[PDB]
Symmetry: C3
Subunit: 320 residues, 3 copies
C-alpha cells in the first residue's frame, strides 16, 4: 500500500524552499528516512500597499516552505515554534495517514519542538495546515503549505516547477484600508473575505517577483488552495493546461482552461511557453482577481512567434 520496505541509505535532511520555488526532484530509487525541520513564526508582513497583517507562518512565508519526499519514505517531522509566538501551533499534513494528519502528535507551545514520524504511503500534492483551535483562524492567518510525495518513478521532467497557493483573508477593515489589519472572525464565519491572494500578499508574484520562463520551456505549477473557505476557479490568462492533475490526483485531464481547486485541496497544471509576454494566474471567480487581489504573473521572455500569436495587426474605422 506504498510498501517499498524499510528506510535505506543516508538519512536525508530535507531542503525546503520558500515560495514560489520548489526543491529539485528527489532522483532516488530507494525509500529513505527524511528529517523535516519547520519553524512556526508569527510576524507582521505587508498584505497590500500600506496594509500590514499579523501572519502565522510555517518557515516565515505564506504559503509555508515546500516539502518534497518520495512515496514510501519515513518522514521524521520536527515542528519548532519560535519563543516569540503568542499561540501554540501544530501541523496536519494531508499526506499523513493517522489522527489529525499529525495534529494530535505535534501540539507545540512557544519555545518548544514536537517530533513525530510517519510513512508517506500515497503519492500526491498535499496541503499541510495548522489544526490548533480555533482551526479556521490559524488557517486564515496563513498557516498552510504543500508537501509533494513523488511517485516511486518520479514526475516527468520539465524546465520550471513553481509553488503557488491561493488563500482568502479576513481583515476587520475593507480592501486596501491602510494600517495593521486585525483578523475578523465574523467575516471568516460568513465566507466574506476582504482579500483573495496568491502567496500571501497583493503583488506577491508581480513586477520583480513574477514567475519567469522562456519561450519553448514546459512549466509545472503545484497550485494549493489553503482556503480557509473559497474554492478557486484557477485559470492562467493566455495559457491552456495541456494536463491537469484534477484535485491533485494521479490521473490527468487534458486541454483545460480553468480547473476547480477545493479548499484544503490542490492541483498540478502543466503547459509549454510558446509566445513571449505576461500570463496572469487568477481565480476566475473574477471579482476576486481584479477587485480583491487574486492575481499573479508568469513572464515569458524570448522570440515573438507571429504564426501562433500576431499581436495587434491593424486598427480601422468601423461604421456598422
Amino acid at each position: 500500500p506504498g510498501d517499498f520496505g524499510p528506510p535505506r541509505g543516508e538519512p536525508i535532511h530535507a531542503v525546503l524552499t520558500s515560495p514560489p520555488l520548489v526543491p529539485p526532484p528527489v532522483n532516488r530509487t530507494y525509500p529513505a528516512k527524511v528529517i523535516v525541520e519547520l519553524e512556526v513564526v508569527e510576524k507582521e508582513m505587508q498584505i497590500s500597499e500600506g496594509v500590514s497583517y499579523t501572519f502565522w507562518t510555517f518557515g516565515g512565508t505564506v504559503p509555508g516552505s515546500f516539502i518534497r519526499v518520495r512515496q514510501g519514505d519515513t518522514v521524521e517531522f520536527h515542528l519548532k515554534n519560535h519563543p516569540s509566538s503568542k499561540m501554540p501551533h501544530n501541523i496536519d499534513l494531508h499526506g499523513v495517514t493517522g489522527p489529525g494528519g499529525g495534529a494530535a502528535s505535534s501540539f507545540t507551545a512557544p519555545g518548544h519542538e514536537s517530533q513525530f514520524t510517519f510513512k508517506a504511503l500515497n503519492e500526491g500534492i498535499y496541503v499541510y495546515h495548522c489544526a490548533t483551535a480555533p482551526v479556521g483562524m490559524h488557517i486564515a492567518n496563513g498557516m498552510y503549505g504543500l508537501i509533494l510525495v513523488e511517485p516511486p518513478e518520479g514526475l516527468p521532467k520539465v524546465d520550471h516547477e513553481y509553488y503557488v497557493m491561493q488563500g482568502d483573508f479576513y481583515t476587520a477593515g475593507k480592501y486596501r484600508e491602510k494600517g495593521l489589519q486585525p483578523f475578523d472572525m465574523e467575516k471568516a464565519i460568513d465566507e466574506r473575505p476582504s482579500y483573495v491572494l496568491f502567496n500571501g500578499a497583493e503583488g506577491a508574484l508581480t513586477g520583480d517577483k513574477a514567475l519567469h520562463a522562456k519561450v519553448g520551456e514546459t512549466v509545472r505549477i503545484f497550485v494549493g488552495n489553503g482556503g480557509p473557505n473559497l474554492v478557486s476557479s484557477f485559470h492562467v490568462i493566455g495559457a491552456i493546461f495541456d494536463q491537469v492533475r484534477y484535485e491533485g490526483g494521479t490521473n490527468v485531464q487534458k486541454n483545460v482552461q480553468t480547473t476547480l481547486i477545493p479548499a484544503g485541496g490542490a492541483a498540478v497544471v502543466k503547459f509549454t511557453a510558446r509566445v513571449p509576454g505576461s500570463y496572469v494566474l487568477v481565480d476566475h471567480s473574477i471579482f476576486r482577481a481584479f477587485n480583491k487581489g487574486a492575481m499573479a504573473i508568469l513572464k515569458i521572455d524570448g522570440a515573438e512567434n507571429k504564426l501562433v500569436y500576431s499581436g495587434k495587426e491593424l486598427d480601422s474605422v468601423y461604421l456598422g
Copy 2:
C-alpha cells in the same frame, strides 16, 4: 442502454437502511422488479444541543433511507405521505430517466400513496429529494437521500460501506441559539446557512453514533450533498482517498486529499484504515467544519503501527 431486458423471478421488496448504513450488495446476475416503499414524516428533531428544527424527511431520517438496486432493474416506487404531514410531497430521484426524475408522477398529499414505475438505465450513486414548490424549502428541511444503482457485475467487495450526506440549513436564529428554530427563507436565498451538517444534526455521527472500522479494513463511503446551495470540499482528516468516483461517475481519480461534491451531487471515496484513532469527515471550506457543525467521526480500532504513525516521540525546549 441498461438493456438486460424484462424483469425475472418474483418481485423483490427492497430493504432500505437508515443512515449511516447501506443495504447489502444485490448479489444478482439478472434484472428484477424491485418494489420500493418510502414514507414522508414531518418531525421535530435536535439539529444541535438544545436546538430543535421541524425536519421534512424520507423514512424518518436526514438523509432519507438508502435505496440499492441494479442497473437494468424495473423499480415500482411507492411514496407514502403520513397523515400527520402539513404539506404534500413528491420525489425527484437523479437515477430516474423521465420528467422531474419522478416529481410529476409522485405528487402525494398528506395521507396518500403515489405509485410510479421507472427502469434504472444508468449505474451510479444518485441524489433523490423532494421537488414540491418551493423546492428550495423542501430540500433545506431535509428531503434528500441516495439511491445506489449498481453495475451489472456489482461493486468491488469492501469491509464497510457507509452513508453520509452533507446539507446546509437556514434557521431564523444564529448558530446554537436554543429552542425550536423556523426555516429562514432570506438566509436560504442569500446562501448564508446557519448550520452545515452531516446526517441532519451537529453530533449526528460523533461519540457512540460514530462510524466504525478496524486497521486493515477497506472502507467505502457514499457521500451525498443534498445542498440546497453549498458545494462540499469533502475531506477526511487523517486519511487519503485511494479512489474517488469524482461526481459519482464510473471512472476514478486516485490519491486525492479533498474532492468537490456538487450541490445535488454525490461522490464515492474509498481508503484502507491503517492507523487507530479518530478521523473527521469535514467540509474543508473549513469554517463550515469548525464553526457551523460540518464534522462526523470515523473511529478506527486495532494495533498501533508506529512505522506508519509514531504519535509524538519527543517534546524539547527550542530558542
Copy 3:
C-alpha cells in the same frame, strides 16, 4: 513536440459563420488547416432581463452569450473585433483557446467605431470561454460579454442528433430580483458575489416557452455548457436526465454516468445524453435556490412516443392511514 500544429493554412480562406445561442455552427468536416476569418461585432443595448425588467447588456454579436465560434485545431484564426460606434465603452476579447497575452485582449483593444485585427493558431482542441478583458473586467463580464469558441479535434467530435449552446451567468442589479424598470449594474453586489439573478442565455426565460430547446425520443443531445460567471460555480444538472458522458471542466477525457457536474467560473463542460422519455427536462444550477428563486432554469422539450417500461407516469393514488 506540439500536436495541433499542422503547418500554415491551406486552400482558400474560410469566412466563418457564427451562430446565435442556443444554436451551434455545423461540424467543420475538414482534413487540412485553414485561414479562418472571424468577424465579431460588439453591441451595447437594453434587453428584457425578466418580465418588465430592462438591463443594459454589452454583447458580442447582439446576444448573451455571444455568437458561437467553431474552428478546427491547427487553424489560423484572423480575428476582427468590430466595436459599434453606438458603444459607450471600448472593448477587447480574451479567448481561452488562444495561446498568448490576454488570450488576445492585448491585441484587440477596440474603441467605439473602430475594428481590431489579430491572428492566432488554435493549438488546443477543447471548448473555450471567451470574454471581454477591458477594465473593469468583472463589470464587462457581468454586463454579458462572454461566449464560447469550439476548437474541434482534427477528426472532429463524434456525431450527435442535436448540439446546443447554453451559458450560465450571475447578474448584479441595483434593484432586487424582479423589481421592474431599467436596472443599473451593482458593483457592490458583484464584489460581494451576491447576484440578484442567475440565468441561462442572458434572461429569465431565454430558454422557456417558445424559446425552449427541442429533441425527439431516441436522439443524442450534446450541450456546450459555458459559465461566464463572473463569480458563481454552476452545480449543473438536467432534471430528468443523466449525463452518459461529461467532458469535465471542458477537457478531452470523459466521466460517465454523472448527475451534476461543477462548471468553474470562466469554464465550460460538454454533456451528452440520449432522450428516452417524452416531456419537459430542466437545465438548472443545483445550487438550487438559484434555479427556483433567481431564474437559473432552461427547458429542453422532448417530443415522441411514451415508453411505459422506462417511465410509467403516476400509476395509482391510494389512501394511506400510516
